[PDB]
Amino acid sequence: SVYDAAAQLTADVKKDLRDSWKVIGSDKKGNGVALMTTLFADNQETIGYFKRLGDVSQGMANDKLRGHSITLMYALQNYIDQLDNPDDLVCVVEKFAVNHITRKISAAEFGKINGPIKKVLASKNFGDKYANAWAKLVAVVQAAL
């Protein structure tokens, strides 16, 4: 359950999330778009879910993709800001899950974002330690799908 998964966010995990986000969240547009393009490159099968975005290969030049990418980063910002209060983190996660459940995005499908996050982190000198911390946060969302 999402409640048990949120309890997996221990002291050090929350700390590593904040330290890495401090850098990653500094450039929401750049890292957000990098995140999306990496997802589409490593998992071409997910492109079907984003038909509305148009030609995703245009990257930054695609206004709809850029708008989506920037917005996506504010969802992560939201998560990070709610780390202090488990009750708030949970209600925010369930709220977020609504539209993804409606699009029929499964926990397994959502989990594909872990690869792109790991690669973006690595490009900023954040190793496995951080990728694993982010995988734990992603697991909270997966628990609600």
Binding residues for heme b: 100
Alpha carbon distance 25, 53 (integer Å): 23
CA 101, 104, 107: angle at the middle one, nearest 5?
A: 75
Alpha carbon distance 36, 67 (integer Å): 11
DSSP state letter for 137: H
Binding test (CB under 8 A) with its own copies, winner from 63, 101, 123, 129: 63
Indicate whether 50 belongs to the interface with its own copies (CB under 8 A). Answer: no
Alpha carbon distance 8, 93 (integer Å): 15
Indicate whether 124 belongs to the interface with its own copies (CB under 8 A). Answer: no
| 28 binds, options ligand HEM, its own copies, none, Cβ within 5 to 8 A by partner type | its own copies
Scanning 16-24, 90-98, 105-113, 126-134 for contacts with its own copies by CB under 8 A, the matching segment is 90-98
Residues in region 66-85 near its own copies by CB under 8 A: 66-68, 70-71, 74-75, 77-78, 81-82
Nearer to ligand HEM, 76 or 83 (CB): 76
CA distances from 45 to 6, 15, 20, 103, 139 (A): 29, 34, 29, 15, 21
Which residues in this chain contact ligand HEM in the complex, by CB under 6 A? 46, 49-50, 52, 68, 71-72, 75-76, 95, 98-100, 103, 105, 109-110, 112-113
